[PDB]
């Protein structure tokens, strides 16, 4: 089936039957039988992988057969690399096992120093341990990545709870424009491409305008279903994503991944306006920056909600003094710097006890009237929140007999930073300007999400006004 | 002048002027002229350059003269490595520059070069990504080290405030004895050992019964003072620590350092009961772990107190509410899980106001009485604390001066083959040498405890002046 916009969602990009020509593939079964190969296995590998033939030291060499043989009898999913001369030019020979099949991949040797990488990994461990902000390691390491590799541009994305993603970091040649503060949707990265970005630390496209070197046979006879190139390194790129880059005028791609638990938290994307390829051992070197950042960013966000937790249980002890000192809360809760309006990031708030109604920062008495009416279907629902409806509402109930409530509200997510001052067939939706527009229709009517912590607190305050109201 | 127990605290082990046999050293200067060499240069490298000699292309080879030439052309601390054949075998050419002198060291190569170093790492730096408990991170990368390296035993040290170290993780083999919960004086690791352990992530001892392969000349002509070998990997070992390891039945060492800022926070100590050696590409696969791990111990500690604080200002909200919804300053402080009892880690606590007092966990009024009698010297003190004194650790604050409002938190005291120099060079001989260093003392008062006792005094200041109504 042809792959257009209505199909781009489900389009299998793991089983393309194709690869990139910068290397060759040979797929083997449980015993070592050649099930198929890229039609270019004789471009530089002087021999012919004939469907149904076998491995021979006269085609592949000692070290290769040696390695492969280790894998067919390998305990855990087999994966490894080997540098040995195959034919007349030198090769990087990397393989791996997936499902019940086996794969081999051959890269030519582009004629690094390790100490010179273990050295400026301290330029990054040091540089971010004075500064302690995830935004500044992303910002910092993003600069360092550019220097290490030479990529025309390199960006760092963060992925929100909606898998939307933003450009929170950038280093580019001043010859090019900027994409900082860019918000593209969850669509631009489909469930089956993102799943791949997690299974693979690094993904590398050597050339975008490349011609797909299909591997044949198309289907693997044992199963009669398309082979699964998920962990493949030369796997072909989606034809839709290709048109994207060549519109952006970008001709190469490499992506270090940041994985927290099981989420794609963010990744460093590196474009290059001309065909750029990096040797394999160098990409296993960056696969190391991958885990590092996923491990500092791990406890930065878990050492920064602990800060939010600190300053929100301080300004929640303050209202334990102010409120018992004078004795009717409508005072302490309206306090400017401490007190509810600031306690939980919002664009407004409301306090409701008895008949009195204190609307901090705006007239929210009318909305609160509706939110309590739709709380008559839910009696005994001492909490409520929503990102649509002034469409942000978070409400807790600290007193039942007398209407005892607290409201915080929000507006649509406002684009933090904006800017001001070559088309493809499949439409204009395939460009930066289009990605942004298609995000704007997703959040239309959607207020910033109530964060995991913005709700921990809401449930804490309600627990203080509980023992504070009663007595 | 020999080195005994008496000197060993000042032993200049950074300038030994000798190396471990398994490799060779060649000291150069700015312009690339040889200044010295180990006495085993010919045993290992086919050729023998002279004192004063220039680069002998015969000896080092093209790719290495390419490395040295970009090290002479450029300032600041230089660092790099190569692989090449020199003589019958081939080596790791591991060169650096410290101060103004150069050092080129050579180690055997017994092969995946750019894929072994990068393979070993993802194996252990993902051991740091897995837990949230800073005792788990230590218990685990200890076990994972044992497995990666086959070392007979590998330990994890946590260094305390006084610099005395504690063994907090261990995986030995069933034959060996346990060293878990062993405590040893800050002197076991002399001033310049604790320095080199910080300025150098990894330290490798090939053989403890080894015979030092002295480098000559012994005095650098340029300066007329011994060679400074701080950032060296084949530097000789102190005779005292050798005699210590052969007392323990140990001949092979390799330790990963943990530096949290400028302190030696702790380290992983790998032992082996028979000679052992780790390839250079695998030692750098650890030296990079050393840094990330210091980075993650960094956050796992600054996030562990940022949690203590959070639980402090929460149970400060417990008594603030309990004493303000009543007039019971005492009752509120008294509670089992809230208040002074469990606000700060203590073996006892005591609150005074007027002629009344209550002491949780014992009879502390007798001692507070004397802590006061001693504070009639400079009445102005609002905070006071030390670890010496009966119940030996006292943290005291004052919240109401007119009626002697005081708060106290108390702490008790901290819980056949032989050498040419004595028994004291043994695990048992060190556990006692620590039972003397910390006697009279008690668990120090952390930067955190103090920051809390302070927030609790202000907290009580405000609740007393608040009975103005
Ligand atoms: C509906 C399917 C897709 C559309 C539409 C599309 O544009 N790409 C689609 C599938 C894939 N996207 C893949 C990676 C990917 N896509 C984006 C989208 C962007 N949004 C932006 O605003 C910008 C730039 C300003 C981009 C590039 C990004 C950022 C990425 C990640 C890699 C990169 O940054 O270049 C993707 C993976 C392909 C592969 O490597 O196999 C597919 C498929
Ligand atoms: C005053 C000189 C020394 C005394 C006394 C001493 O005990 N060691 C002295 C010199 C050095 N020690 C060095 C490292 C070091 N020493 C210990 C001592 C231990 N105490 C214990 O209880 C145990 C085990 C149960 C030991 C091993 C330790 C732990 C270490 C750190 C390295 C390791 O764990 O192997 C030292 C550095 C030598 C070097 O490598 O240059 C010197 C010098």
From Swiss-Prot, chain A:
Annotated GO biological process: detection of visible light; osmosensory signaling via phosphorelay pathway; regulation of DNA-templated transcription
Keywords: ATP-binding, Chromophore, Kinase, Nucleotide-binding, Phosphoprotein, Photoreceptor protein, Receptor, Sensory transduction, Transferase
Chromophore binding domain, as annotated region: 13-471
EC number of this enzyme: 2.7.13.3
Keyword Transmembrane helix attached: no
First-tier enzyme category under EC: transferase
Residue intervals of the GAF domain: 133-297
Annotated positions binding a tetrapyrrole: 8
PTM info: Contains one covalently linked tetrapyrrole chromophore.
Catalysed reaction, written as an equation: ATP + protein L-histidine = ADP + protein N-phospho-L-histidine
Molecular function terms from GO: ATP binding; identical protein binding; phosphorelay response regulator activity; phosphorelay sensor kinase activity; photoreceptor activity; protein kinase activator activity
Free-text function comment from the UniProt entry: Photoreceptor which exists in two forms that are reversibly interconvertible by light: the R form that absorbs maximally in the red region of the spectrum and the FR form that absorbs maximally in the far-red region.
Similarity comment: In the N-terminal section; belongs to the phytochrome family.
Name of the protein in question: Bacteriophytochrome
Lineage: Bacteria, Pseudomonadati, Pseudomonadota, Gammaproteobacteria, Pseudomonadales
């Amino acid at each position: 089936t042809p792959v257009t916009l209505a199909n781009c969602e489900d389009e299998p990009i793991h089983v393309p039957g194709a690869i990139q020509p910068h290397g060759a593939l040979v797929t083997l079964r449980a015993d070592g039988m050649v099930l198929a190969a890229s039609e270019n296995i004789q471009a530089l590998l002087g021999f012919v992988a004939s469907p149904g033939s076998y491995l021979t030291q006269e085609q592949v060499g000692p070290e290769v057969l040696r390695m492969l043989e280790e894998g067919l009898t390998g305990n855990g999913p087999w994966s490894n690399s080997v540098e040995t001369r195959i034919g007349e030019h030198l090769f990087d020979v990397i393989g791996h096992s997936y499902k019940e099949v086996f794969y081999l991949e051959f890269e030519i040797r582009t004629a690094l120093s390790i100490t010179s990488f273990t050295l400026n990994a301290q330029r990054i461990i040091a540089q971010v341990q004075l500064h302690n902000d995830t935004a500044s390691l992303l910002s910092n390491v993003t600069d360092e990545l550019r220097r290490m590799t030479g990529y025309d541009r390199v960006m760092a994305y963060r992925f929100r709870h909606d898998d939307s993603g933003e450009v929170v970091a950038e280093s580019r040649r001043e010859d090019l424009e900027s994409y900082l503060g860019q918000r593209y949707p969850a669509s631009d990265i489909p469930a089956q491409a993102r799943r791949l970005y997690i299974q693979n630390p690094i993904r590398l496209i050597a050339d975008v305008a490349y011609t797909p070197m299909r591997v044949f046979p198309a289907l693997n006879p044992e199963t009669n279903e398309s082979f699964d190139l998920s962990y493949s390194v030369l796997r072909s790129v989606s034809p839709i994503h290709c048109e994207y880059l060549t519109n952006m005028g970008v001709r190469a791609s490499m992506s270090i991944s940041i994985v927290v638990g099981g989420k794609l938290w963010g990744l460093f994307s590196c474009h290059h306006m001309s065909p750029k390829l990096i040797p394999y051992p160098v990409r296993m070197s960056f696969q190391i920056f991958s885990q590092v950042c996923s491990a500092i960013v791990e406890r930065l966000e878990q050492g920064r909600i602990a800060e939010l937790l600190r300053v929100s249980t301080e300004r929640r002890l303050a209202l334990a003094r102010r409120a018992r000192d004078a004795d009717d809360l409508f005072g302490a809760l309206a306090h400017p710097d401490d007190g509810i309006a600031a306690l939980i990031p919002c664009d407004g708030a409301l306090v409701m006890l008895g008949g009195r109604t204190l609307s901090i920062r705006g007239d929210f008495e009318r909305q609160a009237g509706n939110v309590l009416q739709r709380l008559q279907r839910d009696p005994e629902r001492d909490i409520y929140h929503t990102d649509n409806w002034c469409c942000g509402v978070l409400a807790i109930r600290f007193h039942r007999q007398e209407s005892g409530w607290i409201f915080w509200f929000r507006h649509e997510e406002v684009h933090r930073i904006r800017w001001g001052g070559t088309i493809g067939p499949s439409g204009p939706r395939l460009t930066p300007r289009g990605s942004f527009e298609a995000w704007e229709e997703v959040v239309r009517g959607h207020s910033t999400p109530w964060s995991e912590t913005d709700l921990a607190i809401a449930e804490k305050l309600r627990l203080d006004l509980m023992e504070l109201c009663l007595n």
